[PDB]
Amino acid sequence: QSRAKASFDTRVAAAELALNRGVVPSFANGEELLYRNPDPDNTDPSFIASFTKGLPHDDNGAIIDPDDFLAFVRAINSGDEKEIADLTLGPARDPETGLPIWRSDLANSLELEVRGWENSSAGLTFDLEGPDAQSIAMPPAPVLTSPELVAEIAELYLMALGREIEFSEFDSPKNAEYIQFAIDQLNGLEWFNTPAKLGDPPAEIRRRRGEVTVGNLFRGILPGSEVGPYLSQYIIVGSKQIGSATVGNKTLVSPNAADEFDGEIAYGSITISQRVRIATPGRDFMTDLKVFLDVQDAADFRGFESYEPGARLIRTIRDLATWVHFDALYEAYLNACLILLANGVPFDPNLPFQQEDKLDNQDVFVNFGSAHVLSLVTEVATRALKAVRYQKFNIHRRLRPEATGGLISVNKIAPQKGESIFPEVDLAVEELGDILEKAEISNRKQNIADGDPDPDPSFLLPMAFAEGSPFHPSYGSGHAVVAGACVTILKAFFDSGIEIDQVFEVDKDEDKLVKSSFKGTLTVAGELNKLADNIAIGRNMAGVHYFSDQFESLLLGEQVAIGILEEQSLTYGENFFFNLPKFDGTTIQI
Amino acid sequence: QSRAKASFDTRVAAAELALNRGVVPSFANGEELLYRNPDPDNTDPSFIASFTKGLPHDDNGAIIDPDDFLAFVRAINSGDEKEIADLTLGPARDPETGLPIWRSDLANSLELEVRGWENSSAGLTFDLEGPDAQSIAMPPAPVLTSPELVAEIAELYLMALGREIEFSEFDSPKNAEYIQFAIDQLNGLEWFNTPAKLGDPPAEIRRRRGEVTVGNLFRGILPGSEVGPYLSQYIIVGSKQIGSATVGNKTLVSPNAADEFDGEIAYGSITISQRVRIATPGRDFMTDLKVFLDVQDAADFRGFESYEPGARLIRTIRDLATWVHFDALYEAYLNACLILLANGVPFDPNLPFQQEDKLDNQDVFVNFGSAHVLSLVTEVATRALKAVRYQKFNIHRRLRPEATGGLISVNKIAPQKGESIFPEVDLAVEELGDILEKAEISNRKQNIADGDPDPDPSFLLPMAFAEGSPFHPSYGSGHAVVAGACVTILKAFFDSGIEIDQVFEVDKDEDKLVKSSFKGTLTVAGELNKLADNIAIGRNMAGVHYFSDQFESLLLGEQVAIGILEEQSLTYGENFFFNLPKFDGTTIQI
């Protein structure tokens, strides 16, 4: 037949495959309308558990006008630029300067303008490849009164309090007091100590973590994420440098071969440095209620974070948070791909032409080679992003962990001032008492450093980011959906079962890589899963995402990648499949 | 309609749009079957102008068996893995060790195995997004007897002899002798001094370079690649580093802000160094006829290049060749995108939600934002690569410039030994006498450095790469097609008319960036065109591509990118278009 007609039929067949996968219906947790305004004569929803950032908020963290959120949801579902622009973003504005009146003196002195919702209708964007953004569903997010939300918030608060603690010293006596504290309180939560009961949602069973130990503290549940050092090799270690190739029987060593162990990736003929920008240690954000409310009212605090000179390999929790702050969409997984390519990590052996050219007479660059995987790992990211944007904006609209910390802080402060507000976070306040007292101490320290000599007692979740979370709902996670999708692409494309012989940790003292004490075996699949773990949890340690957001959007990204892979497989006439270890432990052939 | 049905309809609509663009028929130059075996009783084609690398070659650079090339073409068209594996790749093999007998002692002592054709059938791969690999045509490649081929190989010979000459010193007296020589020889070629005649093919007229000066020597013809310094800003300069953002009225400065002028791209929270690995200066490859013939017989010389320790900003021509040797598919253009995103270069103003958030209430990350452009610039590359693989393997199969230099060298050596061979490169030999004599001197020097105390006189095109070209035909260029596609994506997505206030050159003495002497204005569109120029002509500086390969592959990539953009525009409900300045000076709205 015609080549153009064959191309049309291949594209139509891929669309038919995407359509025949069906639409998994996306269910919210019902929090949007279940929580009501505390005012006895006001029956409108409070929307406290809903992502209400940017809409004008009262002094307690709830929005003044529930209609303001209703218009926001309508604009989400419609996608119209005029309806988005007609939304009220930020607080009341000064008639003279045109600038919004901020609650905090910091945002008023900066003359901060409002920041807008980041692609509130990207979930309505169609996808030429892979699953449609609305064809796949994440499960309902945990509700505020759920023990899962309490466990997630405890994890977030402990990460915020443990931001300056280095990953290589999780078991070290120096951090033993904070590590044992975190382990004790997490294991004091019925989410961690008590297993899932029969009849619980399957995703609830899947994402439930057991007893928290130092070996799995702040770690994911992906296979290989809990095995070995905390940080993935691909997030800290470099790669085989230019010149370290083998030419027949002669093995030439790169003159820059030490750059592999100095965290430098062979990025073509130039280098990607794995060293992260050093955010100011101990400097958290939105620890003051006025600044937090301004951020909830869309105060653009982007770029307000201060940084130490130079760059170091990720050592502290805050370093991982900084890494996931600015990462260029697929940058973690593009870097992992570059490491695997430079290290000569073989592609999936079921890919064609992977044998030595003595046998197949065919090198692989464009298809089943470096270029194919490099393009796939990067094209999967925007598709996963569209799906997660649909999940964030049109389905769940889950409030950010900063907003949950705001509700918890205002609830804990209410008895002190004689009031009683936000009973939905009462379980979180009660079960996180000790974590909340140390959070209050840390917030008092930060707010004294902020400029308030005698700051009000604040239990807000300390934010690694000055703007806090990105300006979209937390559930799901764009970073974690891209993590799932790109790691799925890499595990399918590369021989993910390949064992990593050299396992490196960041040195406990110096800014360098040392051979990890891990005496086990680390696979490529395990380390890619650990890298997805690292990015998603680093979103958690910034305070911008809950754990369940990360795990479920990682699954969503894996689904996006699988759909894309099945659709592109229709484009190759070669007899081949991707051996793809899924996050659930099974392998799919694509 | 249903959302799933709407997704299917959008994908099938993009497929109909791709189908309705039609198929531009792909014409070769007729060189494949026009040159015949000089043996009188043998009437089979010589296939000398055909890409015959890998197929066994005689002592003069032609293939022993035309049936070998015929089977290679049949395997190209079929794409069958078995037929590709059944192809005779490399020379005769030792029955004892199983290794092929190499003509050169270098490849025999290395026990070199064969290297396969890189995606000989990737042009048969269908594309779910954008134009089909076979729906777009690049014009016929110039023939060996054409003055265009003589000009191309002269430019390539001139680049090889000037690989150690720095871009910031093109007009410097110490290189004035080599630059004036190159200018005089190029302007002595009727391709450069004589303009295109009426009735010539329009692509020939469009790609014909006129009078060669110091300010346009070794430069492209894209708009903006001829004004300003040689190297694009994005190939050498860094970008705004993390911490240098503007927060309301306060302008925080990054503690690492000097990294922008040190050639350090803010790659999320980590950095990309623009410094390229220093290939061994004065070390060229395939200068000896035996090593060249082994490479023609698929000798795997990859990684055989040597490097000095460290990395430096691109100064010499060999540095650009090294940069394009290993660049990860979209690396130059992904780096340019990262620079434009870190620098805060505004997106296309016709993109939606690009106003301040006070007006539009919407940030752009997933759609019309950093993630969108990153994913687009990375996904256009593999589609352009498929199109160029079709052009390389199924249509043109143009011999590599190393193979052109082989024919030229054997033709020049034949009268010395009393014979005569390859009269099709007689025009190249006659018109390039001075360049060929300097190439003979340089090749003799390199072959003495290789290990031959008294090497045979060789006029081979010196190769920046030990394997020389990648194992596919030169026409078109994968790097140039990716450059065209990705730079088109960046010019469409970003406000490409934005002027770059700061223009940097690599310092004439130190490995650093100085303020360029350019008193004119440089735009983002011009600098992206210059970056595509830099990559394509760096492939020329390697000696692996001719100029026409580069320019026509850049046009093909621009077509790929435009088709992808049209097909993606159907996926967005926003009222927007990409303002896209083409390589022909016109602007398309997408």
Ligand code: VO4
């Ligand atoms: O959805 V989030 O990347 O803020 O990771």
Ligand code: VO4
């Ligand atoms: O086709 V070439 O990238 O060898 O640029």
Ligand SMILES: [O-][O-]
């Ligand atoms: O091939 O590249």
Ligand SMILES: [O-][O-]
């Ligand atoms: O990040 O969002």
Ligand SMILES: [O-][O-]
């Ligand atoms: O948004 O990211």
Ligand SMILES: [O-][O-]
């Ligand atoms: O490179 O091809």
Ligand SMILES: [Ca+2]
């Ligand atoms: Ca192979």
Ligand SMILES: [Ca+2]
């Ligand atoms: Ca905007």
